[PDB]
Amino acid sequence: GSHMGIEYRSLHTSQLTLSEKEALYDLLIEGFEGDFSHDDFAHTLGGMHVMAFDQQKLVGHVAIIQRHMALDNTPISVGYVEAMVVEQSYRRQGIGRQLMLQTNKIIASCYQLGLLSASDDGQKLYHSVGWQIWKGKLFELKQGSYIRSIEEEGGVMGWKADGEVDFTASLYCDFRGGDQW
Amino acid sequence: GSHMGIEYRSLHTSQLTLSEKEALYDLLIEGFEGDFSHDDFAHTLGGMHVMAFDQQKLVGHVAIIQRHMALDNTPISVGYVEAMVVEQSYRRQGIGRQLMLQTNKIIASCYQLGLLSASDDGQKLYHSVGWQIWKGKLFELKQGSYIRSIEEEGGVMGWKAGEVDFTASLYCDFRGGDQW
Ligand SMILES: CC(=O)SCCNC(=O)CCNC(=O)[C@H](O)C(C)(C)COP(=O)(O)OP(=O)(O)OC[C@H]1O[C@@H](n2cnc3c(N)ncnc32)[C@H](O)[C@@H]1OP(=O)(O)O
Ligand SMILES: CC(=O)SCCNC(=O)CCNC(=O)[C@H](O)C(C)(C)COP(=O)(O)OP(=O)(O)OC[C@H]1O[C@@H](n2cnc3c(N)ncnc32)[C@H](O)[C@@H]1OP(=O)(O)O
Ligand SMILES: NCC[C@H](O)C(=O)N[C@@H]1C[C@H](N)[C@@H](O[C@H]2O[C@H](CN)[C@@H](O)[C@H](O)[C@H]2O)[C@H](O)[C@H]1O[C@H]1O[C@H](CO)[C@@H](O)[C@H](N)[C@H]1O
Ligand SMILES: NCC[C@H](O)C(=O)N[C@@H]1C[C@H](N)[C@@H](O[C@H]2O[C@H](CN)[C@@H](O)[C@H](O)[C@H]2O)[C@H](O)[C@H]1O[C@H]1O[C@H](CO)[C@@H](O)[C@H](N)[C@H]1O
Numbered sequence: 001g002s003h004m005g006i007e008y009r010s011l012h013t014s015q016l017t018l019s020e021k022e023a024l025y026d027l028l029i030e031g032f033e034g035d036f037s038h039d040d041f042a043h044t045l046g047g048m049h050v051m052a053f054d055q056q057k058l059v060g061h062v063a064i065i066q067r068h069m070a071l072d073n074t075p076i077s078v079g080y081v082e083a084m085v086v087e088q089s090y091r092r093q094g095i096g097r098q099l100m101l102q103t104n105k106i107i108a109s110c111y112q113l114g115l116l117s118a119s120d121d122g123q124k125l126y127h128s129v130g131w132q133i134w135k136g137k138l139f140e141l142k143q144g145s146y147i148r149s150i151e152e153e154g155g156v157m158g159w160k161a162d163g164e165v166d167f168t169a170s171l172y173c174d175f176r177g178g179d180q181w
Numbered sequence: 182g183s184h185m186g187i188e189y190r191s192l193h194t195s196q197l198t199l200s201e202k203e204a205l206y207d208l209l210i211e212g213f214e215g216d217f218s219h220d221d222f223a224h225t226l227g228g229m230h231v232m233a234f235d236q237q238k239l240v241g242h243v244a245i246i247q248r249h250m251a252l253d254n255t256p257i258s259v260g261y262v263e264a265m266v267v268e269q270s271y272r273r274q275g276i277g278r279q280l281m282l283q284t285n286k287i288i289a290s291c292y293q294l295g296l297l298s299a300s301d302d303g304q305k306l307y308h309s310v311g312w313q314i315w316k317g318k319l320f321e322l323k324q325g326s327y328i329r330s331i332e333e334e335g336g337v338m339g340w341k342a343g344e345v346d347f348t349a350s351l352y353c354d355f356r357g358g359d360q361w
Contacts, residue, residue, distance in 0.1 A: 068354035106195040174249035174354035
């Protein structure tokens with residue numbers, strides 16, 4: 001739909017054209033001012049994109065990836081939020097909020113828990129739509145064994161749609177290239 | 182689109198209505214003759230679905246879910262194929278093949294490797310569209326460390342759209358029920 005003149009579309013990676021993927025990369029690399037690696041780009045591909053347009057130009061994005069984690073010893077399906085960006089001139093105008101409202105709806109309909117790793121900019125937005133900083137320990141796979149993600153603790157945030165999740169439990173994430181969180 | 186009198190639609194789990202979800206569950210229960218658990222149903226939700234219809238009746242389905250695995254020591258992004266079924270009276274008319282052609286296209290656009298655990302009904306079909314038996318060892322997480330998935334070896338199949346060593350070990354991500 002469209003909200004205050006911005007069109008929002010929800011598209012799986014498999015539904016994007018090459019031109020649309022190139023436009024997405026340009027938006028993301030600019031939005032992070034270069035702090036966006038090739039591995040970061042891989043991490044935002046493979047799930048659902050919510051994309052914001054002013055006329056025909058892409059001006060905002062967020063992706064929701066499926067991840068498979070453990071909450072303590074229990075398997076938990078995760079909607080992992082990646083690569084939220086609003087083009088500079090469009091910021092503080094509600095686009096990030098609209099992207100997150102649609103992201104929350106996607107997570108609620110598919111997964112048991114939303115997770116993400118926040119920037120300082122992002123944290124205020126995710127707080128405003130009901131996410132909380134994860135309070136428990138974080139673990140990632142290195143060479144096939146779990147190690148503590150000590151530096152990422154305090155930066156990961158979560159959201160439970162249906163009911164309650166123990167924010168103090170330990171999370172064990174699945175393996176990928178680059179940054180695990 | 183359409184193919185040979187059957188309509189095909191691709192959609193993400195997040196777009197399913199409750200009625201569509203219930204119809205999918207009923208199709209899977211009937212098509213697997215009940216060999217399909219609540220965990221199996223969870224495993225087919227969260228990714229892309231390709232659905233086949235005779236006019237308005239759901240007659241076929243396959244899902245592609247994103248998984249995060251290790252190939253030996255290297256991370257590999259996986260399109261994991263779940264819950265392919267065609268209603269019994271519609272079988273052997275090419276619906277499964279059309280579902281797999283669309284599945285291959287989704288995997289090729291999104292992931293580095295396709296993987297699935299086969300049934301005897303599907304194995305020759307998967308072979309016919311490029312899939313091959315995984316020859317390497319399979320591992321899964323139990324109590325936070327990897328153990329060999331010995332019973333599943335020989336039944337997992339893979340598809341490379343590139344080059345992939347089909348003798349490498351695969352380390353899958355953690356879920357409930359059957360890991361493969
Ligand atoms: C999971 C991840 O992707 S983390 C990475 C987040 N992305 C980045 O850091 C890239 C650079 N930054 C951006 O692209 C943007 O600043 C975003 C995406 C973080 C926010 O997008 P915006 O469209 O500006 O957010 P929006 O206008 O909807 O803000 C909604 C509320 O969130 C809060 N908020 C948003 N941005 C900020 C900010 N920079 N500082 C303080 N509060 C903020 C405010 O409460 C705001 O409400 P208000 O404007 O009425 O005070
Ligand atoms: C990853 C997974 O989902 S594994 C589980 C697969 N699903 C099941 O076992 C549920 C029960 N079985 C079914 O629903 C169906 O038998 C399916 C989905 C496996 C196949 O669906 P169909 O629509 O019948 O497949 P389709 O008609 O496209 O067959 C294409 C080719 O695959 C082969 N094939 C398909 N089914 C069989 C079979 N039961 N026995 C031998 N060969 C078969 C044949 O070579 C066939 O070509 P042909 O008909 O010209 O001889
Ligand atoms: N002290 C070390 C912190 C550790 O490196 C870490 O958590 N690092 C965090 C790793 C995450 N993958 C990053 O995720 C965010 O940005 C990525 C691109 N840069 C996107 O791909 C990702 O989709 C998004 O979600 C996140 O931004 C990083 O946060 C860190 O970098 C931010 C930018 O400077 C800071 O604002 C944060 N306070 C700081 O913790
Ligand atoms: N000997 C041990 C076999 C081991 O249990 C195993 O690999 N078991 C395999 C476990 C997989 N999760 C199953 O996956 C298939 O069927 C599931 C529903 N039953 C779907 O959810 C799944 O989406 C699909 O992909 C797969 O079919 C099972 O295969 C086994 O059961 C099949 C049906 O009887 C046989 O035809 C196979 N030859 C046999 O290996």
